[PDB]
Design an enzyme around this catalytic site. Structure first.
Site, PDB file in Angstrom:
ATOM      1  N   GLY A  21      17.424 -47.449 -23.584  1.00  0.00           N
ATOM      2  CA  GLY A  21      18.532 -46.952 -22.781  1.00  0.00           C
ATOM      3  C   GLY A  21      18.867 -47.762 -21.548  1.00  0.00           C
ATOM      4  CG  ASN A  22      22.231 -47.431 -20.210  1.00  0.00           C
ATOM      5  OD1 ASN A  22      22.751 -46.351 -19.901  1.00  0.00           O
ATOM      6  ND2 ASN A  22      22.514 -48.028 -21.361  1.00  0.00           N
ATOM      7  N   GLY A  23      19.727 -46.759 -16.928  1.00  0.00           N
ATOM      8  CA  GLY A  23      19.673 -45.787 -15.840  1.00  0.00           C
ATOM      9  C   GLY A  23      20.992 -45.758 -15.097  1.00  0.00           C
ATOM     10  N   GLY A  26      20.656 -50.818 -14.283  1.00  0.00           N
ATOM     11  CA  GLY A  26      19.586 -51.448 -15.050  1.00  0.00           C
ATOM     12  C   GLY A  26      19.197 -50.769 -16.348  1.00  0.00           C
ATOM     13  CG  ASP A 140      22.510 -38.361 -12.842  1.00  0.00           C
ATOM     14  OD1 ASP A 140      23.343 -37.563 -13.359  1.00  0.00           O
ATOM     15  OD2 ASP A 140      22.434 -39.583 -13.150  1.00  0.00           O
TER      16      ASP A 140
END
Ligand SMILES: c1cc(Nc2ncnn3cc(-c4cn[nH]c4)cc23)ccn1
Ligand SMILES: [Mg+2]
Ligand SMILES: [Mg+2]
Lengths: 289, 295
Positions: A21-23, A26, A140
């Protein structure tokens, strides 16, 4: 306290395997501790202009507040120095079973059993309570930031928004975090994560957050204007409806605290707790394809 | 090469960089020609969306100010696995105009450089607009330079927004700073009304970006900037050093109400864009920069 100057190169210590995945900023790789072969999640972020202090912040929060079973544990931080624009590797505990978004997506009829929702929500709430006592707002909370381990443990990730230049997905955002005519300076309070937690419960129940069919910009306009979201189906228990209602109080001033919601009958009363841990575990193994 | 495609890239293109929304340097198998390739993990339902959006694609030729979009390909994976979408475009070696202003002392470009670059963006936009296409993402990062100081607009299928409708990043709001007031939903605009003139506001923000190194409101939290763009009067240049012609150009682009904003053709006739006497020397000055940084 963390200084980028002291941070070593990850070579021989950690290696990347495949992207998972991704954040906020990054990519997130499934990594491996070279010497033991033990899996770890590695967040690889490019250290640039402005992002230099944004990525530095995530390290300090992850380091100090991840010492709870419902928050994915910080392992370490490294810099794979490139010609004089470097790469920072942020290493933490790997959560093999993936996100709760992945779970509901890989479930027949894209819905989870109510007792699964009760267990997962309580684990999110417990991790939230730990952050809130430490005066930290996650900011989040969404199914994508709620991960499962191979043994059905629930852990919170991503301190990337926690208290860059991109506004993320709006669907789990509380009305008060969205700026409008009568709310010009937004107004993030810890109770913002509880709204997000309730939307994550609708996500576990229906496979998607409310307003998923809306363009993100339109959903951002509707969240502060619309009444509290509700579950579509009437099948759900009165306790579940009350929990949703509890999380989704429009005005955060009347919204309950994390401690109050942890005492909600839907969260507090879980007699089949042991069996759902077995059921969930069995379900992540069943997803062998 | 077919632009109403979805064929496998084997024998047409290949990744001549590391395997793995990131962009990798690729090449045409038969010619060896360099290309820029965007790779995204797509679900089975997402491939159907691509089929429909391929039907929504508008037709337009090559243009010297648009890094040519070659097409959409699908690199297969085992049945029940996430296939990857390939979007191929002409390669622009020297990088973005944001890179150009970052690699400049005081993060500002000479006014005549801003005049040359803006006109090239405008010319590429006119070509898209005459073909009933909105770029939708005009910003310094999407304005690229070639080895020979040519200015080209990023195009990964801008007429269908294929790189913005699939992937996890598709549901994100994105960066707000180059957004026109009409693309942001608010009290008097409950529906984001995208128009060809939205690119012209973006063009004015990209000109402030070339002039100051950053767009207006860069110091604001993105959520706060999103709230301020529709409420604030048109952004202005901080410094008074700039020519009257440059201030007028900025003012021309940044008309708050898009109904009252000039067209690409009108802005191409603006004295700042139209009157460029040192054009030849600027093309040399820019070519000199690409060479100096190539070490
Ligand atoms: C920090 C961490 C993060 N992601 C993960 N952190 C920890 N473990 N982990 C396992 C998976 C994963 C497993 N399967 N698919 C994805 C993804 C992750 C996202 C943002 N910030
Ligand atoms: Mg503590
Ligand atoms: Mg922990």
């Amino acid at each position: 306290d963390i200084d980028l100057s002291s941070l070593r190169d990850p070579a021989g210590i950690f290696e990347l395997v495949e992207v998972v995945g991704n954040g906020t900023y990054g990519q997130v790789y499934k990594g491996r501790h070279v010497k033991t072969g033990q899996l770890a999640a590695i967040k690889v972020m490019d250290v640039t202009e402005d992002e230099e202090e944004e990525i530095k912040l995530e390290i300090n929060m992850l380091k100090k507040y991840s010492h709870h079973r419902n928050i994915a544990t910080y392992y370490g931080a490294f810099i794979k120095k490139s010609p004089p624009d470097d790469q920072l590797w942020l290493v933490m505990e790997f959560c093999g079973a993936g996100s709760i978004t992945d779970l509901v997506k890989n479930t027949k009829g894209n819905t989870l059993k109510e007792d699964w929702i009760a267990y997962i929500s309580r684990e999110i709430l417990r991790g939230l309570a730990h952050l809130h006592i430490h005066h930290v707002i996650h900011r989040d909370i969404k199914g994508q930031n709620v991960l499962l381990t191979e043994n059905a443990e629930v852990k919170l990730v991503d301190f990337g928004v926690s208290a860059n230049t991109f506004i993320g997905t709006p669907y789990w955002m509380a009305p008060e975090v969205i700026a409008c005519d009568e709310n010009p300076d937004a107004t993030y309070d810890y109770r913002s994560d509880l709204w997000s937690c309730g939307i994550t419960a609708i996500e576990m129940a229906e496979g998607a957050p409310p307003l998923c069919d809306m363009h993100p910009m339109r959903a951002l306009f509707l969240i502060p204007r619309n009444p509290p979201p509700r579950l579509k189906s009437k099948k759900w228990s009165k306790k579940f409806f009350s929990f949703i209602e509890g999380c989704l109080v429009k005005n955060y001033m009347q919204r309950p605290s994390t401690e109050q919601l942890l005492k909600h009958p839907f969260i507090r009363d879980q007699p089949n707790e042991r069996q759902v841990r077995i059921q969930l575990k069995d379900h992540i193994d069943r997803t062998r394809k």
